[PDB]
Write an enzyme that holds these catalytic residues in place. Structure first.
Site, short mmCIF file in Angstrom:
data_model
loop_
_atom_site.label_atom_id
_atom_site.label_comp_id
_atom_site.label_asym_id
_atom_site.label_seq_id
_atom_site.Cartn_x
_atom_site.Cartn_y
_atom_site.Cartn_z
N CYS A 135 -1.56 2.80 6.37
CA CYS A 135 -1.22 1.45 6.76
C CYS A 135 -0.74 0.67 5.55
O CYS A 135 -0.97 1.04 4.40
CB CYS A 135 -2.41 0.76 7.42
SG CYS A 135 -3.85 0.54 6.31
N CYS A 189 0.82 -1.26 0.00
CA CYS A 189 0.00 0.00 0.00
C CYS A 189 0.84 1.30 0.00
O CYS A 189 0.39 2.35 -0.46
CB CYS A 189 -0.87 0.03 1.29
SG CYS A 189 -1.64 -1.60 1.59
N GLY A 246 -0.06 -3.50 4.20
CA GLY A 246 -0.32 -4.91 4.48
C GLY A 246 0.82 -5.62 5.20
O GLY A 246 1.99 -5.30 5.00
N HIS A 276 -8.41 2.18 -3.58
CA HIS A 276 -7.06 2.01 -3.06
C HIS A 276 -6.21 1.21 -4.07
O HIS A 276 -5.84 0.05 -3.83
CB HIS A 276 -7.08 1.31 -1.69
CG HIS A 276 -5.72 1.14 -1.08
ND1 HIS A 276 -5.41 0.14 -0.19
CD2 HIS A 276 -4.57 1.84 -1.29
CE1 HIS A 276 -4.13 0.24 0.15
NE2 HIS A 276 -3.60 1.25 -0.51
#
Ligand SMILES: [Ca+2]
Ligand SMILES: [Ca+2]
Ligand SMILES: [Cl-]
Ligand SMILES: [Cl-]
Ligand code: NA
Lengths: 381, 380
Positions: free
Chosen positions: B366, B91, B368, B336
């Site tokens: 955040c 991410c 993963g 996202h």
């Protein structure tokens, strides 16, 4: 800015991708094994003080997907507080990992990093999941792959001699124990399917001779082609890794640096002139280091093809220094070119050779697919 | 060391991955479009003077494989002499691209770089080519919902935040707040007709808390609270920034739009999904010499309402949500697209900082398997 020192540098054996040592060992496990080993070999480092992990890998799908740097670090039981990122500049990925980690240290965003890379080509082959943009389509393989050998008059015989030399030198290093300082014994399976700890590069062929290489057919044009499979990099599975930190932190911990980074360079070049990268990358790294090629005592130049590395050597003015200074323990023809791992692998091989030759300066450099090049100058102390 | 300035920050519209705008446009083309655009928009920058291109992308196979950074740059006709690298911190990938490019500039190895990222989730879905090591761990309800259980974040609170995301994104669409950052990008309309898109097709203005309350839990049928409606949307997109030393900007007469104040990345416990923004932001603020109250605009990536709300709470920001946080909506509405999101939220942040006349912004997300990344930007 802090200077960046390499405190340790290690690698797995290079396993034969076609049915060899690591056919049942996953990429994340080869990686985790080296990460664990770097920590184990350096007890003064407390693992939670690692600031980041940069890992090269190209074919990021299947067992290499979803940020292998982090997956491997978790498998290695590095504290989860340590972050991790996977880097892809094709062939140069783990040298890129070294560069980005070093700059994280120089700027003070980090004091200690793990750097390295992996490629498990047996599990995630270069042909797997290919979908090249039609707009980049650019007989064309020989045209491009042998452009430098045609330009520099590098014959099939010269290529075969260089390839025979690669295996002979890698085998002599194996026989003498010269690779013992860098290879970490790694579990695989022997030919019978039995668990085996490998402490040598399975992929080297001590039976290689120029005579046998001379029998092989050209890889490209049957009539004018000079490259063969025997003078191209082998297909191996492997990982390599380094522990890098500020000179300050090494001193605090009482660790003798094995080498220091003096300069780094990365360049683009014409994608249709395959393998040329080391020339402008090396010239730029040398300029940035305040050095000439003559100052370098040991070179590691990745052997993607003898037909490309020889022209690069010629262009850098190094042809008469090949046997004194270049790829002294062989190269990718004998050891393979597991893309993600190769940058850190040749840097690891270079540093060990610098120590044994008491060299002041070393240069590691490589071509990168679709026209790039990357180089690092290292200095001892 | 040179200060690093952001001279331009742009993005494509966010296309609906399930049959929407970019279903027939390749990842390398969305990326090359933005590279060309940065060059067109900043004519005094000569393309051969770029020192590197850092591009985030996670699912690096098929059209996103084999170093998409380079492939996109060649398609954009950036000179061959400019190098390019693809970076993957899930991410956080394109925020990582920003950090590594920034540091290349800081140390003097570069003076100007392109930074950005792409994820074409329609063409290379998250579920494609998965082979997760059996010895390892946003699915699984226990881990996805841990923060919401620790902090008592109810289904109703999650649905409220999700509806807010679409409302804020739609308001931004209507007010012209996205006009400065969105580059019109060719796609295809519902009938297959070529169409230049200049708005985020994926936003659903009709979203209501009433409609969201009807959905089934994504995880445990009995006790689960997260739903698809309160999880990030599936969109295809790219984002990009032109970043250079403050000196080079001056030489080229290009106005800096923001500058990097601090950068942070951290690992965290992978079984406590979505917590990363807390330690990342605290570290970034500490390094910046700032407190959370100094920040005028926050962009906190909306992977799940169940995770971003606890993060907001632990940073002490619950009373500032409507004043400072995701003011033009977030990933629940906009999607996202992993590789693109870091640069995307940075781009949205910088444009909001301009519109709000802010001095400090913080963008964080955040990542993963338990990471967090953050950047503090300053507008002088
Ligand atoms: Ca040692
Ligand atoms: Ca000397
Ligand atoms: Cl903009
Ligand atoms: Cl500014
Ligand atoms: Na030095």
């Amino acid at each position: 800015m802090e200077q960046v020192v390499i405190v340790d540098a290690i690698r797995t054996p290079m396993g034969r991708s076609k049915g060899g040592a690591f056919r049942n060992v996953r990429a994340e496990d080869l990686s985790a094994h080296l990460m664990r080993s770097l920590l184990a070999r350096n007890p003064s480092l407390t693992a939670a003080t690692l600031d980041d992990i940069y890992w090269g890998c190209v074919q990021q799908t299947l067992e290499q997907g979803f940020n292998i740097a982090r997956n491997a670090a978790l498998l290695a039981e590095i504290p989860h507080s340590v972050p991790a990122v996977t880097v892809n500049r094709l062939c140069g990925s783990s040298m890129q990992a070294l560069h980005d980690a070093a700059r994280m240290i120089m700027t003070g965003d980090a004091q200690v990093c793990l750097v390295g890379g992996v490629e498990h080509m047996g599990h995630v082959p270069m042909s797997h999941g290919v979908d090249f943009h039609p707009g980049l389509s650019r007989g064309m393989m020989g045209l491009t792959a042998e452009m430098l050998s045609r330009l520099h008059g590098i014959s099939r015989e010269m290529q075969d001699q260089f390839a025979a030399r690669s295996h002979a030198r890698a085998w002599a290093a194996t026989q003498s124990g010269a690779f013992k300082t860098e290879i970490i014994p790694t579990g695989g399976h022997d030919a019978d399917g039995v668990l085996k700890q490998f402490n040598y590069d399975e992929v080297i062929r001590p039976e290689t001779t120029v005579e046998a290489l001379s029998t092989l057919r050209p890889a490209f044009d049957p009539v004018s082609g000079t490259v063969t499979a025997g003078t191209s990099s082998a297909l191996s599975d492997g990982a390599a890794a380094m522990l890098v930190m500020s000179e300050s932190r090494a001193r605090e911990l009482g660790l003798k640096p094995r080498a220091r980074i003096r300069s780094m360079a990365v360049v683009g070049c014409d994608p249709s002139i395959m393998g040329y990268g080391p020339v402008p990358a090396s010239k730029l790294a040398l300029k940035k280091a305040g050095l000439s090629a003559s100052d370098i005592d040991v070179f590691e130049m990745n052997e993607a093809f003898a037909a490309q590395i020889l022209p690069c050597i010629k262009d850098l003015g190094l042809m008469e220094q090949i046997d004194e200074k270049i790829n002294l323990n062989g190269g990718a023809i004998a050891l393979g070119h597991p893309l993600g791992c190769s940058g850190a692998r040749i840097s690891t091989t270079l540093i060990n050779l610098m120590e044994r030759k008491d060299a002041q300066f070393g240069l590691a450099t490589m071509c990168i697919g679709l026209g790039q090049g990357i180089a690092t100058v290292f200095e001892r102390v």
